[PDB]
Design an enzyme around this catalytic site. Sequence first.
Site, PDB file in Angstrom:
ATOM      1  N   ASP A 144       0.807  -1.229   0.000  1.00  0.00           N
ATOM      2  CA  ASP A 144       0.000   0.000   0.000  1.00  0.00           C
ATOM      3  C   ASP A 144       0.841   1.280   0.000  1.00  0.00           C
ATOM      4  OD1 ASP A 144       0.753  -0.124   2.811  1.00  0.00           O
ATOM      5  OD2 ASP A 144      -1.011   0.984   3.422  1.00  0.00           O
TER       6      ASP A 144
ATOM      7  N   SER B 113       3.223   2.304   2.180  1.00  0.00           N
ATOM      8  CA  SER B 113       3.833   2.564   3.479  1.00  0.00           C
ATOM      9  C   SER B 113       5.028   1.669   3.793  1.00  0.00           C
ATOM     10  CB  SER B 113       2.786   2.422   4.606  1.00  0.00           C
ATOM     11  OG  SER B 113       2.283   1.103   4.683  1.00  0.00           O
TER      12      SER B 113
ATOM     13  N   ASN C 250       4.484   1.736  11.394  1.00  0.00           N
ATOM     14  CA  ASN C 250       3.969   2.096  10.064  1.00  0.00           C
ATOM     15  C   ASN C 250       3.820   3.587   9.756  1.00  0.00           C
ATOM     16  OD1 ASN C 250       1.396   2.134   7.897  1.00  0.00           O
ATOM     17  ND2 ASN C 250       2.756   0.359   7.590  1.00  0.00           N
TER      18      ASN C 250
ATOM     19  N   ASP D  57      -3.958   4.188  22.314  1.00  0.00           N
ATOM     20  CA  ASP D  57      -5.036   4.571  21.409  1.00  0.00           C
ATOM     21  C   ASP D  57      -5.794   3.473  20.649  1.00  0.00           C
ATOM     22  OD1 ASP D  57      -4.503   7.247  22.295  1.00  0.00           O
ATOM     23  OD2 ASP D  57      -2.966   7.490  20.788  1.00  0.00           O
TER      24      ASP D  57
END
Length: 129
Positions: A48, A50, A59, A101
């Site tokens: 993708d 990254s 990432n 998170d």
Amino acid sequence: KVFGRCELAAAMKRHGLDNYRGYSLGNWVCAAKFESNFNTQATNRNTDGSTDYGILQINSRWWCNDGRTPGSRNLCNIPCSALLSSDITASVNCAKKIVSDGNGMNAWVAWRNRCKGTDVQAWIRGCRL
């Protein structure tokens, strides 16, 4: 830099990782072993666009900015290159934010398949802490 299992176990403990959010020190050492094999310089390119950077393969699509990932969110507010440093301070502070998170340590598939529910105490045994 390539850390030795014990050298890394001590550094992470000094940085407040032991039982951080419920994950004892071994989980973090075990993650690092299978993610980067303890090399702070490890980088991995994904399909993708990254890239995963550093000792905990963080990432570039969500966490740091490498100037070459489409739709980057840079949530750790850090250039991905700071994660390739010998000093693990930056990789740790961001790893603490990813683990706070969200899905805990599920962000790391290697931890999920190779560490979760195993005797993670094996990773810190023999080490002087």
